[PDB]
Structure formats: structure tokens, C-alpha cells
Amino acid sequence: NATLAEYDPVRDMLTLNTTTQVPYYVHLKVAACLQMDSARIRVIKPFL
Amino acid sequence: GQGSNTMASQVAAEVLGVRLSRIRVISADSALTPKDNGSYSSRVTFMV
Amino acid sequence: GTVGVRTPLVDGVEKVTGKAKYTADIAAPDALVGRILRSPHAHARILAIDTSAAEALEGVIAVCTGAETPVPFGVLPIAENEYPLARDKVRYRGDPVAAVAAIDEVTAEKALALIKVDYEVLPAYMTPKAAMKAGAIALHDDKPNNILREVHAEFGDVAAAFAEADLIREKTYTFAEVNHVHMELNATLAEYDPVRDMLTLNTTTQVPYYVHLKVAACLQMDSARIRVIKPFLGGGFGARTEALHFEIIAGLLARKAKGTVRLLQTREETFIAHRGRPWTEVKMKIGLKKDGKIAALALEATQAGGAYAGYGIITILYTGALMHGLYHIPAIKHDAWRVYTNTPPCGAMRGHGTVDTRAAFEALLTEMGEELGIDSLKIRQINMLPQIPYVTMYAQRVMSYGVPECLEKVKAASGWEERKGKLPKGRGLGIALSHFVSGTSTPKHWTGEPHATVNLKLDFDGGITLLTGAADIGQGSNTMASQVAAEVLGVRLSRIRVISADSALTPKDNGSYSSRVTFMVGNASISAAEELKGVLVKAAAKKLDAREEDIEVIDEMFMVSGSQDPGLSFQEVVKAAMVDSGTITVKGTYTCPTEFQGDKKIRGSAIGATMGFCYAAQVVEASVDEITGKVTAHKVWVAVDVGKALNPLAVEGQTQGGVWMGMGQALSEETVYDNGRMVHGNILDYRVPTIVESPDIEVIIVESMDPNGPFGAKEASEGMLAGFLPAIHEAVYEAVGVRATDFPLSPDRITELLDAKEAAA
Amino acid sequence: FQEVVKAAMVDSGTITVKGTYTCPTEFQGDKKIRGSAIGATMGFCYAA
Amino acid sequence: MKNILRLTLNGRAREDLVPDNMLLLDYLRETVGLTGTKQGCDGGECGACTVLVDDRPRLACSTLAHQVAGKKVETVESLATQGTLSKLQAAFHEKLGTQCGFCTPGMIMASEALLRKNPSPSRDEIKAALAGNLCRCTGYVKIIKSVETAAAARLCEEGAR
Amino acid sequence: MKNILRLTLNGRAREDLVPDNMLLLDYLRETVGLTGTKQGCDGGECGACTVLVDDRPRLACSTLAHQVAGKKVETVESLATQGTLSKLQAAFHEKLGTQCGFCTPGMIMASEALLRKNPSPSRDEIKAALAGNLCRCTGYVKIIKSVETAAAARLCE
Amino acid sequence: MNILTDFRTHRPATLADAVNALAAEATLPLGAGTDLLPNLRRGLGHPAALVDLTGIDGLATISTLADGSLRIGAGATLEAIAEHDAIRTTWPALAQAAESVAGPTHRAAATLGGNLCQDTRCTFYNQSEWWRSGNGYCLKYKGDKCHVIVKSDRCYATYHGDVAPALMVLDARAEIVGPAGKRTVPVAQLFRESGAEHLTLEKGELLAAIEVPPTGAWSAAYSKVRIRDAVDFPLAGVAAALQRDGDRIAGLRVAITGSNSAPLMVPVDALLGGNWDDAAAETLAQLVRKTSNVLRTTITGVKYRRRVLLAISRKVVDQLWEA
Ligand SMILES: Cc1cc2nc3c(=O)[nH]c(=O)nc-3n(C[C@H](O)[C@H](O)[C@H](O)COP(=O)(O)OP(=O)(O)OC[C@H]3O[C@@H](n4cnc5c(N)ncnc54)[C@H](O)[C@@H]3O)c2cc1C
Ligand code: PCD
Ligand code: SF4
Ligand code: FES
Ligand code: FES
Ligand code: FES
Numbered sequence A: 001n002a003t004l005a006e007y008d009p010v011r012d013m014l015t016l017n018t019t020t021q022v023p024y025y026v027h028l029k030v031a032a033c034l035q036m037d038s039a040r041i042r043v044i045k046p047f048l
Numbered sequence B: 001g002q003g004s005n006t007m008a009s010q011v012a013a014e015v016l017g018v019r020l021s022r023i024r025v026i027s028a029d030s031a032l033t034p035k036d037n038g039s040y041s042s043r044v045t046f047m048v
Numbered sequence C: 001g002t003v004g005v006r007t008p009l010v011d012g013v014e015k016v017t018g019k020a021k022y023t024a025d026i027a028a029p030d031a032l033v034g035r036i037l038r039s040p041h042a043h044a045r046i047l048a049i050d051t052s053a054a055e056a057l058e059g060v061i062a063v064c065t066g067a068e069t070p071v072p073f074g075v076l077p078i079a080e081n082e083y084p085l086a087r088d089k090v091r092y093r094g095d096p097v098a099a100v101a102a103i104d105e106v107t108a109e110k111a112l113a114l115i116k117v118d119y120e121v122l123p124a125y126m127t128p129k130a131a132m133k134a135g136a137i138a139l140h141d142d143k144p145n146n147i148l149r150e151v152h153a154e155f156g157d158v159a160a161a162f163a164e165a166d167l168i169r170e171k172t173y174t175f176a177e178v179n180h181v182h183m184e185l186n187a188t189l190a191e192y193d194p195v196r197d198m199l200t201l202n203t204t205t206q207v208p209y210y211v212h213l214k215v216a217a218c219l220q221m222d223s224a225r226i227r228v229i230k231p232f233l234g235g236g237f238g239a240r241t242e243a244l245h246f247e248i249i250a251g252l253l254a255r256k257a258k259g260t261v262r263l264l265q266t267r268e269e270t271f272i273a274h275r276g277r278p279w280t281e282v283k284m285k286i287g288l289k290k291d292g293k294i295a296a297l298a299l300e301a302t303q304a305g306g307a308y309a310g311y312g313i314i315t316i317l318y319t320g321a322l323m324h325g326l327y328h329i330p331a332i333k334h335d336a337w338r339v340y341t342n343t344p345p346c347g348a349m350r351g352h353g354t355v356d357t358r359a360a361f362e363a364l365l366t367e368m369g370e371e372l373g374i375d376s377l378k379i380r381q382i383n384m385l386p387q388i389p390y391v392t393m394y395a396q397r398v399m400s401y402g403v404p405e406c407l408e409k410v411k412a413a414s415g416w417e418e419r420k421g422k423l424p425k426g427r428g429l430g431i432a433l434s435h436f437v438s439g440t441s442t443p444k445h446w447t448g449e450p451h452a453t454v455n456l457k458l459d460f461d462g463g464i465t466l467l468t469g470a471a472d473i474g475q476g477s478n479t480m481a482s483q484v485a486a487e488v489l490g491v492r493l494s495r496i497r498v499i500s501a502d503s504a505l506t507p508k509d510n511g512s513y514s515s516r517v518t519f520m521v522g523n524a525s526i527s528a529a530e531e532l533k534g535v536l537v538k539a540a541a542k543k544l545d546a547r548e549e550d551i552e553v554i555d556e557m558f559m560v561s562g563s564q565d566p567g568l569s570f571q572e573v574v575k576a577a578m579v580d581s582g583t584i585t586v587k588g589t590y591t592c593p594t595e596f597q598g599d600k601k602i603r604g605s606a607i608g609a610t611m612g613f614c615y616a617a618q619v620v621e622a623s624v625d626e627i628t629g630k631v632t633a634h635k636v637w638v639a640v641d642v643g644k645a646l647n648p649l650a651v652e653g654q655t656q657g658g659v660w661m662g663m664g665q666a667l668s669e670e671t672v673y674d675n676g677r678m679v680h681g682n683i684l685d686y687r688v689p690t691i692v693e694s695p696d697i698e699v700i701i702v703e704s705m706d707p708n709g710p711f712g713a714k715e716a717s718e719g720m721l722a723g724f725l726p727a728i729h730e731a732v733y734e735a736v737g738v739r740a741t742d743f744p745l746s747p748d749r750i751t752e753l754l755d756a757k758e759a760a761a
Numbered sequence D: 001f002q003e004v005v006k007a008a009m010v011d012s013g014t015i016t017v018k019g020t021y022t023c024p025t026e027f028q029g030d031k032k033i034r035g036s037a038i039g040a041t042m043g044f045c046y047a048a
Numbered sequence E: 001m002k003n004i005l006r007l008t009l010n011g012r013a014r015e016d017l018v019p020d021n022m023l024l025l026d027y028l029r030e031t032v033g034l035t036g037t038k039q040g041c042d043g044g045e046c047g048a049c050t051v052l053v054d055d056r057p058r059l060a061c062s063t064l065a066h067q068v069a070g071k072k073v074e075t076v077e078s079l080a081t082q083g084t085l086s087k088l089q090a091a092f093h094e095k096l097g098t099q100c101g102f103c104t105p106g107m108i109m110a111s112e113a114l115l116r117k118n119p120s121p122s123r124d125e126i127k128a129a130l131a132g133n134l135c136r137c138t139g140y141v142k143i144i145k146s147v148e149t150a151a152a153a154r155l156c157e158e159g160a161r
Numbered sequence F: 001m002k003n004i005l006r007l008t009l010n011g012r013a014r015e016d017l018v019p020d021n022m023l024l025l026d027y028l029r030e031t032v033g034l035t036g037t038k039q040g041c042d043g044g045e046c047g048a049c050t051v052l053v054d055d056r057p058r059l060a061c062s063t064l065a066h067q068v069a070g071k072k073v074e075t076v077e078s079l080a081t082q083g084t085l086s087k088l089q090a091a092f093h094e095k096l097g098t099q100c101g102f103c104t105p106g107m108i109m110a111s112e113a114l115l116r117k118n119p120s121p122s123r124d125e126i127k128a129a130l131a132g133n134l135c136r137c138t139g140y141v142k143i144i145k146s147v148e149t150a151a152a153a154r155l156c157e
Numbered sequence G: 001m002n003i004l005t006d007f008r009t010h011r012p013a014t015l016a017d018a019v020n021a022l023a024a025e026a027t028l029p030l031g032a033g034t035d036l037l038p039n040l041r042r043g044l045g046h047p048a049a050l051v052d053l054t055g056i057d058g059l060a061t062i063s064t065l066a067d068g069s070l071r072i073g074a075g076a077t078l079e080a081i082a083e084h085d086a087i088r089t090t091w092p093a094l095a096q097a098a099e100s101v102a103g104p105t106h107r108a109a110a111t112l113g114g115n116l117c118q119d120t121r122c123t124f125y126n127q128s129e130w131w132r133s134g135n136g137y138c139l140k141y142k143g144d145k146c147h148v149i150v151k152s153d154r155c156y157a158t159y160h161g162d163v164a165p166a167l168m169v170l171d172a173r174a175e176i177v178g179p180a181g182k183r184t185v186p187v188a189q190l191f192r193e194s195g196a197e198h199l200t201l202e203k204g205e206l207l208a209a210i211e212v213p214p215t216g217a218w219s220a221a222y223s224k225v226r227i228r229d230a231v232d233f234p235l236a237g238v239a240a241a242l243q244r245d246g247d248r249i250a251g252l253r254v255a256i257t258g259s260n261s262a263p264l265m266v267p268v269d270a271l272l273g274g275n276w277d278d279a280a281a282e283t284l285a286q287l288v289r290k291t292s293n294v295l296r297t298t299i300t301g302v303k304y305r306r307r308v309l310l311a312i313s314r315k316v317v318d319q320l321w322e323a
């Protein structure tokens, strides 16, 4: 398991590359758990 | 690893009558690809 | 709102942190080093070529020659005469003859030396007059007299118009050839996948679409097997608005090596690629009335165009096309010759083809107005287009014109009235007007496609992705497109992620040339945002139980017009809009109306035809040291009609850059060849101005509000370059009393003028 | 295919299409049975 | 031949086997992989490769990597604090002292050296410090404004401003 | 402490200052940047980090980088010729001896070492050589087919 | 990666160590490399080794001697020299010349020794390996013909160093160290008017320091001409030192650069005792013209370079006289 998280403080945007089969769910839970608007989050599943 | 990128290419090429090689699949990047519910319960081949 | 707001470019953060990856910064561990064997002769036939010793060198993976590149290329479909690698003959020193891909630089360098080439040296011609001499060997067989294209046109009765003039003068002006000197060196990273026979390129281009076409045609590879990506680009200013040989060679080598090849270029090789502004001789003849009104104009322009066609035909047409649309001129005669020479091919450079004739026209008008006792700023005000709209004799349709305000603005800002003609000994003030198109309204390739296409995507997350094939080359197109789409949607700039110039993902765009991007991609972007806004308004209306016409979008809120209730947040509307829909994808397009594409019965009138012009008026204050002859530009006051400044911060920077590149051509830049050999191949002897002598430049924005531009906008990057030359020319005359006729006005030319004026009188 | 693509670009430019799929309500279990959505599917893979 | 090179780069100790003939520019771009430092010319003419060596500007393309042994070297990648821009970087971005962005790393490093040595430079002093840094996009006007804005933002309150 | 390490890696001479306590796995993935070699466990249990040292298989996660001084080291990145797959790689791809692909680099390196030492391995010999390499996707069936196909293709080269 | 020969880079801690390293073949001294590296990158030289002098302790020290003389180690940077308060108040021409060199970034590391010993320049020489091999190289390096003066009796590449002329009118001395030992010569003698052997340093020799004597009744200045206001080498450079008695020229020293294969003193005794007037200025101009030998080794023309050389010679003496 692994997650690469890139937070851009200038723009307050977050980009994740993570070991998931469900990037949509990760997108939802990261937004809700960080109380961060989903439009500021980008989730990418690279090779898994 | 199950082959959904191949599966999607195959069925789309079949309908279009083109060769597999004419299709470039871009997948699982929220800024570019349409949301998918996830690779669980073997829903991918059937629905996607 | 986002439009009209001073906005840092959306990709600025990556530039100041060094995170922006330009072509040469892209990691590719498996990359072979590519190198090109260039011709040491200016003109010669290739008799034989032997690559066997190079091919046998350990570490050499591939070696190619012209035998493998049987298809020529040219930016214009009607004139493709350049081969990626030379076949039969070379036509300038630097002309590519062979190329190699090796494991490292030292090996690639050894490989080049091992290639044996037998040449039959031919006579080389440096000037138009020499290349045109009877008996001169033809660079290209289809043009026996080395004249690529001649233009001969007349508008109105010129002879009659001149007979009606009270004062007629003519003068000849010469302009050195200049180079773009974009700071990033040319480079291409070519990745060939032999398992699938696919090629992917990252390259230093302003026109990834053209590269896509030329690589497919030149390698005889289906375009569907090629992917072109423009990463961050370190400028271009015209240099990269044509597919360049090293990009094609990189792909050729990658395929031959069955792998990846990184082809870097030195600064000298970047100067060799050239495609800059041609050396130009301009004969200017102007007829005026005693009151200052223009009666007639006759001009001749000869350009030394280098060794291959390229943009030549278009460039030579431009020498006359923009003699129209600025001043009302009763009759115009235009003669011009584009001549092949054994030097690097010339091409498009900021203000493409209109700079030199514009400078010549402005200088003469000013000189004549002095003989008539009319103030140089006044004589321009006197000749402005009488009414708007104005259809020029060239068939251009001017629907917006801010020249009146531009002149009044720079007149006031520079304190022209109280200072012109009343400055200390050695100082002067000059005025000039210039303008340029907001995109050539006719694509180079007639595919019947819209002139710009923008796609938008909006999914459950609420982030809007804007996909455009447009190339942001530092001018800000990624920001421009974001701004106009956000304005239409009533959202914040930050809600838009722009994905650009990657053929596998973004809609094709014709390229960042002729200042077509803001006008066309801005309109296309507006159009796409309207499509999306409509989808969202429908969902909001349904959820608010209101009529769609009643919905207003303000700061990401959808509400019923004039209601006391604030409404739905953007995210609630997105949620509603997803129902029965899922991911929303819309397409927006823009196409120039036929009426703005010139006159069909005037072949070539498409060049110079546009939706509208950016106009610029500038006053330059300079001083001259008579001991050294050096001219110093202290300040420039410049007012530019850009229709509507979408981003005033960018308009200012674009205008300063354009005026400054003109100052470089006016005072210190010039290429120099010695029997075919480049002498200026470095940035020490090719004098790009440093920050020390560079003038301060104050920008005044004028908004004539064009009826067809995005939010009323026109271009804002080329129309102001040309005016600096005549303006400082006038300032030098007031400062020391000499009239330069040759640019640049470097110290050597000024002291010669000072010595002659002192020999006489 | 390339000649058709060329023809298709006229008056159109880039083509982008959207395809979707949704399971009919009848395959989503029985509304009056608790949690019957779990186990409800469009079809089963069978193995011997 | 390769020999040991010890230095502090962007705040971190480095101890590498480096070719005696390696330019600092190539060591940075290829050995450490820091691509922010650019190559804009064939040698010493443009300043795109400017980095800091013990607080002073140095052309990485005209410096052998081995000549900076035991010194403190900084590239454009070291200026931000994690993802937060320094005042100098924010000013170049906000005032548009950067367009294509290619000359920017070098221009910002020369600006950083100036501001560390002369906290409140005059307009002529800014020009003099950036004299060897070529930019083709800006006409330089907004680069000068960017440096003045950065200087004020960093400048001390208890002194003349 | 760092000390000089000289070896041949994927056909190229390396001369680097490497920490005495650095594992070959980390030297490869972090110092040289070759990410093909994977880490699938906490120490010697899965073979995902298998690479070649003088033609023989070696677990990069349980080998100090300094122990391979002067040897010839090869990772999955070295098998192809520029972009053209080796017969063994083409076989894994074509026979589907690879699904998610995570165990593949290690599986292929162990297979390569087998095929260099025993050009025509029996099915039992293939299993014996790949005994320490764990795969969770394939059930191993097509991995064995892949190796048999590569062996035959390398014989009638 | 930028190609350079596979040379060894020696980093001596002392002059003796540097001198010993320079004994080997094809071994070159190295200062900050602002002149040498661009040259080596273009293929102008194929050294087996470079001897870095920037690591020699104390080689960059600047100090004022017992007798009020200035002592500058060869490793001192042009920036340190241009900013040194004592130099700026007492030997301003030196600070002026140093500051006029290249750009600020080059000056931050460029050394005094490297500036004086910089190579001569020519448009057939400062070009790439591809450009030069294509043209048959030339007499200065790998060929046998001079393309500027076809007679080819010698290389005519021009010396464009800015500091040399200033040190020359200030009567500075050059301290040289080599295998034979230490020796000192007037700075003007460090140069030879020959494009391809422009320095009088012998195998194994290094310029170790420069010493400038107290100025006494002399005032000096340096003036340089270039098209851009920074970076450019001098198209012409003139340094002058003056001693004024009432309204007569008691002492005059004039040195030129950017004009010959060496920076040179101009014989001006004919002006001693005279006044400084239009007639005298004209005699200077012609004296300067005679000594100068402006040739087309530059992209800029000879006519202009000669015209401003003469013009600024007047200008700089005039500036001194009217001070
Ligand atoms: C774009 C550009 C513009 C320039 N503009 C100018 C200018 O306007 N004026 C000017 O004068 N120069 C100019 N230069 C030249 C150079 O930058 C400066 O002359 C400078 O002072 C070089 O000193 P350095 O320490 O870098 O020497 P290096 O480059 O290290 O050495 C130059 C030469 O001196 C020899 N050398 C070095 N130190 C010693 C020593 N102690 N004893 C004996 N030999 C030694 C070297 O072997 C070599 O041949 C320019 C260079 C470039 C690339
Ligand atoms: N009204 C208006 C207009 C404009 N804008 C802005 O500005 C810009 C620009 O625009 P335009 O003008 O439209 O343009 P485009 O088309 O976009 O682009 C292109 C151009 O761009 C310019 N600029 C620049 N910048 C930089 N930085 N770089 C460059 O390179 C350049 N180049 C130049 C040129 S030369 Mo050609 O090519 O000769 O034809 S053409 C050209 C944009 O983006 C924005 O930011 C605004 O805002 N507004
Ligand atoms: S002056 Fe002559 S010999 Fe000297 S470098 Fe120039 S061409 Fe070569
Ligand atoms: S890359 Fe141009 S000075 Fe270093
Ligand atoms: S911002 Fe483009 S070269 Fe400076
Ligand atoms: S990572 Fe599992 S054995 Fe090495």
C-alpha cells in the first residue's frame, strides 16, 4: 500500500496517486474527511 | 491487472469496425476521465 | 468577475519554482543522443555519402541520410521544398545532410566525423541582387531566376492620384535581417515504440498541429500512430510556427533506432534554424496635399529570404497587405520580390512581414510633414480612417478602431505639446503608429473545420476541465481561455483546470501564429462555456422550480433574478445536473465569417485579412552621444487598442515585450554572413538588448470594443512592434539632425551619418 | 477510415461522444425486501 | 576521471563521485536532476544558468562542479518552503516578471543574490545586477517591478523604506 | 559512511559513492532511479526484487549494494534492445504470464537466469527456478507457459 | 551533457603545488573559467588537465603595502576590486575598468589574473568546432592560414581585456611565479602583440599578483565603448593618467585595448610641456591612431572601432584635465 499526495498551498489544491481500485470513493472520502471541496481534489490511479 | 483497459478497447473497436491499435485508452484520472463507480463486484466488463 | 481583472498567469507558480518542465527537462532514461551532420558549404551538390564507418562505431544505434526522407515539407502546401535530410544538394551552410543517434554525446560527435560526404561546391549568393543576376545558379529548379514570389498590385489610379499631390518624395530604407532569439534552445524528445509502431513527440513548437502533419507526411507514417505534445515552451515569437527539420529528424532517428531519441540543439544551431525577419530593402514614395492629407503611395520591397520557401510567399504578401487599414489612402501601388539566397531560410517573426515597410512609411510621412510644416503627431491624426466600419481597398473590414484615442493618449502622457521640439541638445521625441491582424481569418489547410474548438468537462466533483489544442508560449493563452470561460459561467478562475496541446487529449488547434489565439480560441471558449452554462441553468431551474430565463449566475450561485433568496451553490447545481446525465462534456467552436476572409477575386488577399486589428501609437524619447554615436532609448509611452483587455496585466507585458523587440531591431540587432558563413551565431555578437540600455515602457490600454471579439477583444502582442523603429528614427533626427536609412541605428551607422552631415552644409 | 475522418471533420472539427449504461430497475432486487439490492445483478458467472 | 565532491546543495549535504570535467550545470541537471537551472546559450552569454554559490551569483555553465567543493550552492528549487513561494517568487508571478518562464530561474537567482547583499536596491542597482540576464518576453519592465516589490515585501520596518 | 562502489549495471560502468549500509534494492530504485525492481514484502519472502548478478538470481532487498562491487548487474530495464522486447518479455506479454504486472520484473529476471543456465528446462525445472517468486494474479499457469514459449523461441532464434 | 575533453582537474592549495601541476603537458591554469570554459566548450583547446587556482589560500587577498602601494593577489575577483573602498578612492581607474567587464555575475567570480590573461578574440576563432573544422580552422588553432590578414605571418586576433590598460597607466607591476622562481615585470610587459602567443608567461608560469604604486600627483581614468551597456567586450578602450602643472601637461600616460593583439602604451612625449587644447588633442588622436592597428577580427566594422578609439582617447584626457 502507498499514496503520493501533492498539496499545492498556493492554490489550495490536492493531487493524489494512490493504490486504489476505487478512485471515485477515495475522491469522496478525502474531500469529506479533509473537509475540502471536491473540486480542489484530483485523484489518479497509476498502474496498480 | 484484470484487463478493463483492453476489454473497453475491444468492444469499442468491434462496434466501429476498427483495429484495436487505433484506440488509446486514458483511464482513472479525475481531471480527464468520466467518473466510474469502481472495480468491485465484477461490475466493470458488464457496465463499462 | 474574471474578465478585465489583472491576473497572474495560471501556470506562473511552476515557472518561478523551476517545476515547469520544458522539452529538454523531460526525463527519459532510455534516451539516445541525436545529432545532425550539417553542411559546411553554402551551396553544393551531394555526390556521394558514406555512413558505413559511423554505423560500425560502437555505441552508434542509427544513422540516416536523405535517402530515407523522400518527402519534402513546407509550412505552405503550395511550396514544400525542404527535405528533413538533404537530397541532391544543400542550399545554406547548416543545411542538414545526415543524422545519428548514439548512446552519448562523445560517441555521437565521433559518429558525425566518420561520415564521408563528397560535394561539388557551387557558387553561393548572399544578396537578392546576386541571386537574381542572369546566369546565377537557381537554388530551386522551379524558380530559374531565384525569385520565389513577386507581387504587383495597384489600388485606385495611382498615376492620377500622384498628379493630384502637392508634394511628392521618395526614399529607400534598408533593414538588417534579425533573429527571434527565444531563450530556450531548440529541442525534440522522440519516443518510438517499435512493439506497436507508435511515435510520441515532446517538442519546442508553437504549432503542434503542423508538426503532427509534417512528421506523418515526412516519415510516411499514419497520423493516427503519432502523438504530439507541447510541454512548457520558452517562447518562440514566430521561430516555431512551422514544423522544423530537427523535429522530423528526431522522429526519423527514433524510428530507425527503434527507441527513444533526444535531439538537443546548440544556440548556434538555433540561429541556423532561424526563420527570422529577412533583410529588406524598401523604396517608399508618398504623395501629399499641402494640408497634410495623403494622396498616393507607391512602395517596393525586396527580401532576402534564405534557402527554402517556408513562409516566403506569405511574408512578401504581408509587405503590402498592411499598408491598408491604418490611414485612409486614396491609391496604392505595391511591388515586391521575395528572393532565395544561400543563407538559413527566413520566416515568421513578431509582426510577420509588415514591420519594415511600416517603419519606412512612418519615417517618410514624418519627414514630409516636416517639409510641410505639419507636426508629426498631427499629420497622423489628419489621416485616420474617416468613418467606421471601414472597408479597405484590400478588402479588410475594420469594425473597431482606437487610433484617435491612442494618439491623444500618448500625446498627453508624453507631454508632446510642451516638449516636442523644445528638448535639450542631443535629445529627441518621435511618434509612430503601427497595427497588426488578430489572426489570419483563413487557415493554411482547407479542411472545412471550425477555426477553433474548445471542449469542457464537468463531473460530480465540480472541477471544470477546459481542453484546448492552443499553445501557451508564455503569452498567456491558458489564462485567457480560463478567464473567458469562467466569466461566462460566473465561476472563479480557480474552478478551471486547463489541459493543453497534447494531441491525444485536446481538440486540434491551428497554432499560435498571427495573433489568432485570443480572438479565435477565446470565442470558441466562450461558446463552450455557454453550452455548459445552459446545461447547468436547466438543472438549476428545474430544482428551483423557476423558468430558465429567470436564472442568474452570480459568484457561483444560481438564483432567480431579483429574488430575495440567494439560490443554489454551484456544487448543488452540479449535483442536480448529474442526475440522468453523469459526466457533462460540451464543445464550443468559432469560425471567421467569409466576409472577413478577403476578396475571392483578389488571389492572396487572404493574407492581411482578419477579424480586426490591434492598433498602437507610441512616443519614444531618446538621446544620442555624438562622441560614440550611441543612441539611448530612455522611455516609450505606448497606447494600444486591444478591443478589450481581458487581462490588463498580460496586455501590458505583451505590449512591453513587443515594443522592446522592436527596440532591439531598431538599435542593436543584426545577423551577419560572410560568404555563407554565419558570423553572429551567439548572443554576444547578435546583440539582444540587456536590461541596462533597455527603455522604460509605459502602457496605456485603449478598448475600442470589437463587435466580434471575445468580450470585444482583439490581439495585443504584435501591433505595437513596428512603430518603435520610425519613432526612434524621428527622435534621432531631432537629437542630432541626421536621417538614418538603414537599421539598426547602431553607433557605427550614426557616426557615419554625423560625419557626412558635417562634410556637407 | 482516414478519408471518412477527413469528411467527418468538415463543419465539425473534433468529435467527442458520450456513452452510458444503467441497470434496469427490474434487475435491482425487490424494494419491499430488506437489502435485496445486495445479490441483485444483471447476470451471474457460473463455474463447475 | 571521477573524484569525490562534497558541498551543500539546496540545504542538503552532498557527497558524490563526479567527473573532473563536469560543468556545475550538468551536475545539477543530470546528476542531481534539478532541471530548474537552464541552458540558454553556448557559454556565458545569457545568465539562464545562474545559481548561487555562497550567496553570490555564479554561471553554472561556466563553472566546473569541482570548483564549488565545500561551498553552499542554491538553485531556484530551494527558494520555496515546501510548496509556499518565497516573496521574491511570488512577486515575479504576481507582477508578471515572468512570461514563458525560461529565463526566470536564472533571473530570480540573480535577484536573490542582489536582495541578500543590498536589501533596498535603487532602480539603477537592480538593472546593474540583472545586466547579464537576458529575457526575450518581457522587455524587462515588469522584472524590475518584481524585484522592487520583493525588496519592499522583505524589507525591515525599523529602517528607511 | 559512503564508499566507492564500482560495478557494471545494465551494460554500463557505474562508479558511485554509496552508503555502506545501502541495500541493492534502494541503490537501484533511488540512487539510479530504476523502478522496475519492486519491493513486495518486508524481507526475502516474495522475489519481487529479483535481479541478476553475474547471470545468477539475487534478491536486491537482501543484498547490500556494496556486495556486488565488480560484478555485472542486470534489472528488467536491461532486457529489451532499445524499445524492442526480448523473446522472454514478448512471451510473458503474449501468453499473459503477466496481469497486474507487479511481480513480473522479478519473475522475468528469475526466468532469464534459468534460461541462460538451462536453455530447455522441463516443466518441473521451471517451477523449481520460480519457487521463490510469488504471484497473486495468475495462478502461475500462464507464467510456466510463458517461460516454455520463451525457451523455444530462444532455441530457434 | 556538454562535451569537454576528459581532463583531470587539479585543486592545489599553494602556488608551488599549482606550478608543479602546470609542468605536465597540455595543462592549463584555471581561474573562474568565465573565459576559458566557453572557449573549451567550443573546442578551442584540448587540455589533459586544468589547474584550478581558486582554491589556493591567500591568492585573492587585496592589501595596501608599507610604501602605500596596492597589492592584489591574482585570485581577487573583479567584483571585490570594483567595490574595494581604498581602490575606488585612490586608484579609481582600476575600479572603473574592473566594473566595466562583462556582466555582474561574471564579475562575482572572474579573477584579476584571469582577466589579464584572457585569450585574444576573432570571429573565425570564437566559433564552434563544426564551424571552424568546416572552414579549415586557422593559424591560431589547428590550421595554417589567418583569414583576416592572409599573409599569415602571424595571428592578428584582438586583445579586448579591460583591466590591463588601466593597470598600465597606473604603472602597475606583475609578479610572476614559475619553476624558475619569482620575477616581476612592468604590467605592460606581460603582453606580446601576437595573436597566438599574446602573453610573455613561460611554461609553468602563473601571474601571482599585481602591485600598484602610490599615485602621487597622477590622476587616471578608464573609458570603454560598446554597443550594449553591459556584457560586451570593449569595441575600443582607453585608459589615461595625467599630471597637470598650471595649464601644461607635466605627465601623460595612455594605454589602449580592444584594438591590437595586445593592450598597448601609446608614446605621447610630444605632448609633454604643451597645453591641453584642440591642437594637442589632435596630436593625441594621431599618436593613438599610429599605435593602434584596428583589424576586422570583430563583427563590428574597423572604421567605427578606429573612429571611437581616437574619440574616447580625447574624451578621457579631457575628463581628467577638467577635473
Ligand atoms: C559573454 C562574455 C562577455 C565578456 N565580457 C568581457 C569584457 O567586457 N571585458 C573583459 O575583460 N573580459 C570579458 N569576458 C572575459 C572573462 O569573462 C573575463 O575576462 C575574466 O576576468 C575572466 O577571469 P577568469 O578568472 O574567469 O579567468 P579564466 O577564464 O579562468 O581564465 C582565462 C585565461 O587566463 C589563464 N589564467 C587564469 N588565471 C591565471 C593566472 N593567475 N596566471 C596565468 N594565467 C591565468 C587561463 O589559463 C585562461 O587562458 C567575457 C566573457 C564572456 C563569456
Ligand atoms: N484583448 C486581449 C488580447 C490578448 N490578451 C492577452 O495577451 C496574450 C496574447 O494574445 P494574442 O495577441 O491573441 O496572441 P496569441 O495569438 O495568444 O499568441 C501568439 C502571439 O504571441 C505573442 N507573444 C509572446 N509572448 C511570449 N511570452 N512568447 C512569445 O513567443 C510570443 N510570441 C508573440 C507572437 S509572434 Mo507570431 O508567432 O511572428 O505569428 S503570433 C504571437 C493573451 O494570451 C492574453 O494573456 C488579453 O488579455 N486581452
Ligand atoms: S586573426 Fe587570423 S589566425 Fe588569428 S584567430 Fe583570427 S583568423 Fe585565426
Ligand atoms: S547557459 Fe547562458 S550563461 Fe550559462
Ligand atoms: S520570460 Fe521568457 S525569456 Fe524571460
Ligand atoms: S522484496 Fe520481497 S524478497 Fe525482496
Ligand code: FES
Pocket (backbone or CB within 6 Å): B001, F097, F098, F099, F100, F101, F102, F103, F104, F134, F135, F136, F137, F138
Ligand atoms: S501479475 Fe500480479 S502479482 Fe503477478
